[PDB]
Amino acid sequence: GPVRLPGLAAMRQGTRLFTPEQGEDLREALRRRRGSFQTTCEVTSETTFAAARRLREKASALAALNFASAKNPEEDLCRGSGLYFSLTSPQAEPYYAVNRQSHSALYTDHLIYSPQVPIFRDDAGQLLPAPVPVNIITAPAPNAGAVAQSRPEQLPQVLPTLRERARRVLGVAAWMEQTHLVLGAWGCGVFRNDPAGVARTFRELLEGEAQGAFEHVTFAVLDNHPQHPTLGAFRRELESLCLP
């Protein structure tokens, strides 16, 4: 029969959906991990997968945040990886079905956890000699641009939606015992969330509820714009977390 391609079945079968009603269990998992580590934080000018590939030898419990679409499984972490084979798993289907029927550009607090997704290619699109597996957390940031255009009365709700969903990202990471996280400018760019505000949201959590819950947090923010405004905003906001 068909050749079994390495690791793809285990990734798909191990994919996990987190639903809104699991918020409290996620909060408890994060609370138990709080204070475990003297967290190291850094803000780097790297792509998400370049950071994951650099760190994957340093740690196996490494997870990256995928800046995902809410409705369909400009580029997310499916590019260069096996992630689509996980996001289309049957257990992940409610993430797409519920977000579609919500009809809200704030979306819902569904998250997908994808274990040991193979990274197949580098930043330039060339094949890696050996794929590099990383865990991936998929959750959509609120689409501030779409809220502003089509439901402006929801615009004051973008910040609390972003914070509560960021809290659940960290909670999923703690729930799956992840020690290393690759975060970044989640929802910035096309969704038009402000970079300083996204950085400040993660700062609030990492200096509070999630303080010491992770060994290492990398904010991978590749920015080649002349004034580096996105990378600069993250560095300015997260300065106090980044001091060695």
Author numbering: 27 to 99, 111 to 281
Describing publication, verbatim:
To determine the mechanistic basis of DrPARG-mediated ADP-ribose modification, we here solve crystal structures of DrPARG in the absence and presence of ADP-ribose. The crystal structure of DrPARG at 1.54 Å resolution reveals a typical macrodomain folding consisting of a seven-stranded β-sheet sandwiched between nine α-helices. Eleven residues (GGGFLGGAQAQ) from position 100 to 110 in the apo-form structure of DrPARG, belonging to the catalytic loop of glycohydrolase, that were not well defined in the electron density maps were omitted. The crystal structure of the space group P212121 of DrPARG contains one molecule per asymmetric unit. Upon ADP-ribose binding, as compared with the apo-form structure, that of DrPARG changes significantly. The missing 11 residues (100GGGFLGGAQAQ110) from the catalytic loop of the apo-form structure could be defined as a loop region in the ADP-ribose-bound form. As compared with the apo-form structure, the bound form structure of DrPARG showed additional secondary structures: a short β-strand (denoted β4′) following β4, extension of β5, and an α-helix (denoted α4′) preceding α4. Consistent with the thermal denaturation study, structural analysis showed that in the bound form structure, the induced α4′ helix formed more intra-molecular hydrogen bonds, especially with residues from the loop connecting β3 and α4′, whereas the equivalent region of the apo-form structure formed fewer hydrogen bonds with surrounding residues. The presence of inducible secondary structures observed from the comparison of apo- and bound-form structures confirms that conformational changes occur during ADP-ribose binding to DrPARG.
Despite the abundance of PARP1, most of the PAR generated by DNA damage is rapidly degraded, with a half-life of less than 1 min by poly (ADP-ribose) glycohydrolase (PARG). The radio-resistant bacterium D. radiodurans encodes a PARG homolog, DrPARG, whose expression is upregulated after radiation damage, so it might play an important role in DNA repair. Our study demonstrates that DrPARG is involved in catalyzing the breakdown of endogenous PAR and DNA repair in D. radiodurans. From observing the structural peculiarities of DrPARG, we show that although previously thought to be an obligate exo-glycohydrolase, bacterial PARG could exert both exo- and endo-glycohydrolase functions.
